[PDB]
Amino acid sequence: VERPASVVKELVENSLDAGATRIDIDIERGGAKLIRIRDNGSGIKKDELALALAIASLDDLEAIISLGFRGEALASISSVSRLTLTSRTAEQQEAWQAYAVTVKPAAHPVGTTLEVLDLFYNTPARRKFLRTEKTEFNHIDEIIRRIALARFDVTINLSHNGKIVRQYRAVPEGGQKERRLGAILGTAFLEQALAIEWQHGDLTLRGWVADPNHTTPALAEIQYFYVNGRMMRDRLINHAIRQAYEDKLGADQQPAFVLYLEIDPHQVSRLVHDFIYQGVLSVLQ
Amino acid sequence: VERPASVVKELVENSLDAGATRIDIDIERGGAKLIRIRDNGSGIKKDELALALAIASLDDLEAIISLGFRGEALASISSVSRLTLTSRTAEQQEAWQAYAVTVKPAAHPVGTTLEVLDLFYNTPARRKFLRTEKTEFNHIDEIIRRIALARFDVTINLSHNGKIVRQYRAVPEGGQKERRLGAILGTAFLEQALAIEWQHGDLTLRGWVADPNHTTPALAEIQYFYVNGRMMRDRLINHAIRQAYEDKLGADQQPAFVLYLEIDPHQVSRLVHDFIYQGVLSVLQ
Amino acid sequence: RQDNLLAAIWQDSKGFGYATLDISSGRFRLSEPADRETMAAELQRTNPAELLYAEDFAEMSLIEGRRGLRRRPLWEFEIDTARQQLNLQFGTRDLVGFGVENAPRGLSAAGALLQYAKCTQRTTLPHIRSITMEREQDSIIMDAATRRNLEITQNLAGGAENTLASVLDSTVTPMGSRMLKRWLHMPVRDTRVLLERQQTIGALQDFTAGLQPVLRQVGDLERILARLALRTARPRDLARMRHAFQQLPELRAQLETVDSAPVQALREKMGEFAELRDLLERAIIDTPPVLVRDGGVIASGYNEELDEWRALADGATDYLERLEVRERERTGLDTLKVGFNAVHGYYIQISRGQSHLAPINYMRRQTLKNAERYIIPELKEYEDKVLTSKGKALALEKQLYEELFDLLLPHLEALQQSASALAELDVLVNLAERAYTLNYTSPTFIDKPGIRITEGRHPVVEQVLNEPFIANPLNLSPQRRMLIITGPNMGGKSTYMRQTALIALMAYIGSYVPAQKVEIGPIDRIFTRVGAFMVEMTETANILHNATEYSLVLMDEIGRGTSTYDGLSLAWAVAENLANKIKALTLFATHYFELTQLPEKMEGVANVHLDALEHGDTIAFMHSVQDGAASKSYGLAVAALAGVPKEVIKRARQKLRELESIS
Amino acid sequence: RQDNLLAAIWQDSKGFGYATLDISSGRFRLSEPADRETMAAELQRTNPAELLYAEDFAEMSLIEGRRGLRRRPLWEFEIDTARQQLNLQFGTRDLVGFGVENAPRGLSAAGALLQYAKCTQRTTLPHIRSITMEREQDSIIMDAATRRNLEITQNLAGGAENTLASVLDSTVTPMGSRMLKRWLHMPVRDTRVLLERQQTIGALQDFTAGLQPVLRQVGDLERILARLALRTARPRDLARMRHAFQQLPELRAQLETVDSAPVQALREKMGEFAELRDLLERAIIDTPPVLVRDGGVIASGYNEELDEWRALADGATDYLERLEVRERERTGLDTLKVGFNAVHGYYIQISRGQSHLAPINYMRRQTLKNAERYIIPELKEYEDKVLTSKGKALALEKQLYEELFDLLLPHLEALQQSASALAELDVLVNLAERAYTLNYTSPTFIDKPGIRITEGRHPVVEQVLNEPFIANPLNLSPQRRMLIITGPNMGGKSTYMRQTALIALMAYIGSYVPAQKVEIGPIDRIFTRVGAFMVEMTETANILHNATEYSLVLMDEIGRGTSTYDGLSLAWAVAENLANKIKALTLFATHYFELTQLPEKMEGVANVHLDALEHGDTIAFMHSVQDGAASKSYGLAVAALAGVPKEVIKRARQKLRELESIS
Ligand SMILES: Nc1ncnc2c1ncn2[C@@H]1O[C@H](COP(=O)(O)OP(=O)(O)NP(=O)(O)O)[C@@H](O)[C@H]1O
Ligand SMILES: Nc1ncnc2c1ncn2[C@@H]1O[C@H](COP(=O)(O)OP(=O)(O)NP(=O)(O)O)[C@@H](O)[C@H]1O
């Protein structure tokens, strides 16, 4: 709970953990004024709202915060905001909403919605710190861009100041990955994109690398590498790709790529480096 | 029943005989399209309308045509028109209307109204004779102008093609003859108007004569002489005034006047001439 | 007995916003001081015990010394957060029910006030259930509905005619026509202003003839003066302006005799400006061109150097002609013309067939399709002087025109005054003609809210109807304050109501009114509700929350509930409130027949109706107002006559017979 | 088997008017053939046994040979006399009830027809009780109410937003935005036209990205071509036009790949005009000034003589500068400036204090307040050449600009075609983007009137609402043809109706529709009636008289009679007629709860309602359509929440309690 970008990310992944395939995000003025996330994933019952935000209701109902670590995250936002939330479960339920210690019913389809008036409401300082409107929107959009590429299968709609900016349509099994890829990365990247698919057993590399011969540093803004859902950064990976780029053409101009690796549980191993370098350089020639 | 001007005059005097003080005449396109005379004088009962235009009136619903010679005049118009008439009498009557053999009720104040779509409706000839819109309106306006000056005490409103042209305000007992006189004759006449009042017993001369020294032939359009309400023409009168004009100034340029003579019911006579000449010439000097 | 109140204040670049609240009583208010001075006046008026202000507040001179000064953060004065929190407190989704929707500068102040209040009290605050505006201009108030519905200037669907404006716009000049229309959107409550105009109208009723024609020649002076200040004014704007000053001596003479203090005042305000008149008579040609850019504006005899350079250029026309005749008849070539071309210059043109007969002298300057053009020494030297002299004359003509602005701008103040005076005359001369020609009477005012009409007419309706309008009386007082009207559609219900509101408006602009006799009290606000439901309920409340004892309220056919009588249930409670608590001058039209029980239940309420007459079974609306409630339903009769097929009507009356066999 | 009919015909300076009648049946009709040819076609179509014509009829070639020719007088074809006689026969005061009020050329013909008929028959003619228009374009018909009420382009009160246009106007160029708006006021019934656009929309859904940006650069080409014809075109109009031609080769390349016969057609229609492109690249500067008047339009390298005279003038800027520096530093007077005055010419200005230090090589040309201006020999001779060279260059620049019109006008026909083609692409590219972005589906058509919606949405409302819109299905056929809707206000009644009408309009312009699935039949006319009484009865009949089996009829909350149930009596008969006789596709919203009896009485009618929920402390409108009639009254709940004072509400609920103790 430091930038507005962070509050967006956590509530986006809260909905993802609930099996959500359509997450519609409406934001206004850097996120300060408004953050509305509506998700179609598993909803929340009437008893289960009350306590997630009331804080002395679990003194012996005891068992229901059990349901989520999302439920643990909601409370940290709501006590220090003008939070508003509506949800409807399973089927033939009514929708229910809460304000910040008061709850009542409402009308909604089976899902969840979460509205926020500029998080900090009792802190005079931590709001007066919050940076620009435009620049924070750019951080939010980056965060969503990174979640977007990891999960080609979830439809995400980003609108700013009312008017829609990003409509990321999901990709079905046996479907078009280009529709989504061009929408995220602009036409620019799509034009020089060369696919890469390398595999030696458990190691599976999927993704794209731009043709260095016509690549400019304007394409090179795009440098993402994910592993089993999330991007970590380690200097090992950094060299593997640049060696392949510098050895393909001696002119070492900035590379453009988006790549996903898939493996077994080890936090890191040497093979990790060599596997990648081999995959990239082959595709180029 | 020859010109539209004549149909106007008769229905105007019909209303006058019924004690009407406000006669609103609305006319459109020379009178062809529309002629509406609305009078606030005594009205007409429900059975009395029926037979004035349905002649077993004075047998079956009888001795009622007795009421008017206006009732004799209505019939001559209505059989040869798309006539429309509505009237309400005395008090707490409903208003009633007819077409010319078909009648029914309506809503009106205590008075009478008379509407006409281009008199001749079955006659192909007598309408194809009727000639201009603008020129016929001028004849009507003249007719009304002559009734206007005879009866200073009745308010008369003439409108053409919707928009009103003449609004002749009546003159009360103990009142201003100038308001009405300027409205009829324009400011032009009013400027050089010298009043005349001569009397030798029964002979009474009232009216106005323009100052010959500044009078032009543009003032001279106005030459009216009435006797007990109606204008007759006889050459005797013609000379009486011109002798006085020619003897006042040798330059015999056209005279401007409006005069009323008043006497007992006996048409005869030489004194008639000399009386007038004496009255006029004195006022000039 | 002393004020112990709370308040909030804020400023943007437009003005300053204000709001006040008491927790001992629950009174919640809003206002918008337009200027710095009025804001100062409003602070000491209220004399609050505590005063919230935004950290950004620039005009500290107003508030520094005030008791209970409290600095607060900016984002608290956010308009939308404000709107949001306020809707919760009242339990709504809109503040239209309170008539303060379009007071955002105040609402930004009330937003931080409530957010502060929420946290400060946390005691019983359901007694804060409302907010009304403290209306600075308690002269006359009109909402959007009233402004379009009366058809002051905009008819229902946006057109211009069948308005009150369309009746009285027989004004001669545009600045007067515009002024008339401002007056209708702004009546005021000062009796002096009203009596000025009425008295003026009466003394001018006779002089209508001579006056109107002269005012027209003035033209649109108001807007020409704008272009003068801007330095855009065109030649023909100054020509009509010149002619306008030629009217002043004449108008002086006509108004001299008119004996009325208000008239003689406008006579002086007119002005004279004989100085400006003389200048333009000498400076500009009788009929100048549209633009200055191509010359022909500044007159000969006005400037020495202008005429000098023009004399050199005016030595052109006669020389070109002599050159043409000399050369044509010396040679004997009849197709010889003297003309000009911007690119090549002057030339002597001869046709193709005669070009072989031109003398050795002629140098070829330009070759055409069927003609050869030539130049000789005499034309070419003369070419230079003529064109350059024109240019110096034309350049000087633009110097002098810019000069004419510098000379006139000094009296701009006095011209603004002359323009406003002339426009006001056109208005008052016009209203005198309408009052006489349309047979209007002057109204009289009283101390208490009350209206007394004698054979009142509807001024717009009476004219387009080429038949009789049924005039009707009216009598209201603080004791007889509500009239319940039932009866037929097109019965004259809304008409009898609407004629009364127009009558009140006409009285409070200072004009005569269409009736025999008019007595009327003070009227502070005019409110208007016209049928059709998101719509209806929302705005019925606006009127209930704001209206006063002195106000005029005009209810047309409310109560379109979701069923039969849930809608009636509303109307009953509605009526009781206006008549019993607010005690305003009210006119309640309704089709619900059951409301005619009230007069016997409620003191100060009375039944009337538009009686109508059925013979055989076709109908004459009398449009005549009578005491007592209507007789019956007339709706089936209405449907038929508008234009429904008779076949259908039979099935309807049959079904009506079924409904009344239930009891 | 035998037409044995009567007809009437007439002409003015606009076109030709037509009317037909039968006395064996009573059928009475009206039409207005727009041109001479269509009029000919309509005569033989009807093949009347007798034909009335005005003595004035000029086009005798149409009618000379026709059987039963009858010359009549002119005054009989008078419009107002006609209007008058006709109102009597039907028993009305207006022909609005018949929807032929705005067809005067035909009504003049029907006027003389009736006047002839009156006299000819004098037999029973009550069987002539009606008149309908024979509408030549039975494609789709819309009255004034429908045109404003759906909010195609004009919102309720005249504003622009919250319209169907405001949603879909995401077009890049103005000629395309205008074209879009024409398409909505004109849908057509030809299956070909509809399938063209649908297929185009689908093949372009993928190419949206590359296309839109290019079209914007074209600018408003349609209106630039107008100024070209007029010869008014400004420098900057030709610059955008030039840049528009630089787009054509690229658009050719983009549309080449798009596999679709309709697309490849428009690809050709686009055009190329590489010839015009080259001219303007050489002829005009990259970014020219607003006017030609001041020069700087025509480029260097375009014309020989232009650059020559400019070289003389261009030898100015650097000489003036050197003269200024030379003379300033020779003398040592720093306040020395070189400037120009239109009247006097060039000068050398020195300040007042330094004027006494000038070498008076300097002749005094002009005296100012605080400066003396001078002229020397070198400047004065140079003055003549610079100004006159500019002039010859500037005069030539105007010669050559007039020349540019002569060069471009030859392709004007083909440019009009390019403008219409580019505008159509902008429309279809736009609709493809909206269909994808807003998640629309393509509709399918059937042979008989009928509608089948799956989770249908309201395209305007769903966008403004930043919350969930509750989508609802629909199923209509000639067997299930009427739905009676009761329930709460703001319940979603009119919404559920209005969403269906928009869906139908969108289908019949060729676009995709906001739903899961859409099946729909033919629809000939759309009719509209919206609540509030002079108003209501008049226009309820228009719809009853004209509507057909294939039409769509949309009733909103009718029945505001002069009492409680006289208004209900109407609505029942109304409904029975539409369902039993006309058998049209009908949607009947009404608050009168008692109409929900019909389905048991009437086959082919069914009950639905907007269910809403009352709980906790408030009401939640589900906006969810369910079978069966509504439960109850919801109006009191509605009133409170919009923003009514709580005080009033208590009195209302009390009164409701009284009404429901009667029964
Ligand atoms: N006093 C009057 N004299 C003559 N004609 C009138 C008069 N009042 C109204 N009319 C006509 O009647 C029509 C409408 O009357 P109106 O007052 O609106 O009826 P209502 O009883 O208020 N109910 P509704 O019209 O159904 O809302 C207008 O078109 C006028 O032409
Ligand atoms: N299906 C829906 N989903 C979400 N909001 C809706 C829906 N239907 C209607 N609304 C909202 O309800 C408001 C008004 O409802 P409306 O349909 O006009 O009520 P109604 O029953 O037709 N009565 P009236 O308006 O008096 O004819 C609109 O402005 C919408 O904002």
Residue numbers in the entry:
A (entry chain D), B (entry chain C): 20 to 73, 80 to 125, 132 to 299, 315 to 331
C (entry chain A), D (entry chain B): 128 to 659, 670 to 800
What text comes from the article?
MMR is initiated when a MutS homolog binds to a mismatch. Upon ATP binding MutS releases the mismatch and travels as a ‘sliding clamp’ along the DNA helix, and this specific state of MutS is recognized by MutL or its homologs. Once recruited by the MutS sliding clamp, the MutL homologs activate downstream repair. Here, we trap the transient complex between MutS and MutL to resolve a crystal structure of the MutS sliding clamp bound to MutL.
We crystallized the MutSΔC800/MutLLN40 complex in the presence of DNA containing a G:T mismatch and the non-hydrolyzable ATP analog AMP-PNP (adenylyl-imidodiphosphate). The complex crystallized in several different space groups, diffracting to resolutions from 7.6 to 4.7 Å. Our crosslinked protein crystallizes as MutSΔC800 dimers bound to MutLLN40 monomers, and does not show the MutLLN40 dimer arrangement through crystal contacts. Accordingly the MutL monomers have the apo-conformation of residues 80–103 and no density for a nucleotide is visible. The crystal structure shows a novel conformation of MutS, in which the subunits in the dimer are tilted across each other by ∼30°, compared to the mismatch recognition state. While the mismatch recognition state of MutS is asymmetric, this MutLLN40-bound conformation shows a more symmetrical MutSΔC800 dimer. Although the complex was crystallized in the presence of DNA containing a mismatch, the DNA is not visible in the structure. The subunit tilting has occluded the original DNA binding site, but because the connector and mismatch-binding domains have moved, a large channel (∼35 Å wide) in MutS has become accessible, which could easily accommodate a DNA duplex (20 Å diameter). The new channel is lined by conserved lysines and arginines, which can govern nonspecific contacts with the negative backbone of DNA, as expected for the MutS sliding clamp state. Moreover, in our crystal forms these channels are aligned between symmetry mates or even within the asymmetric unit.
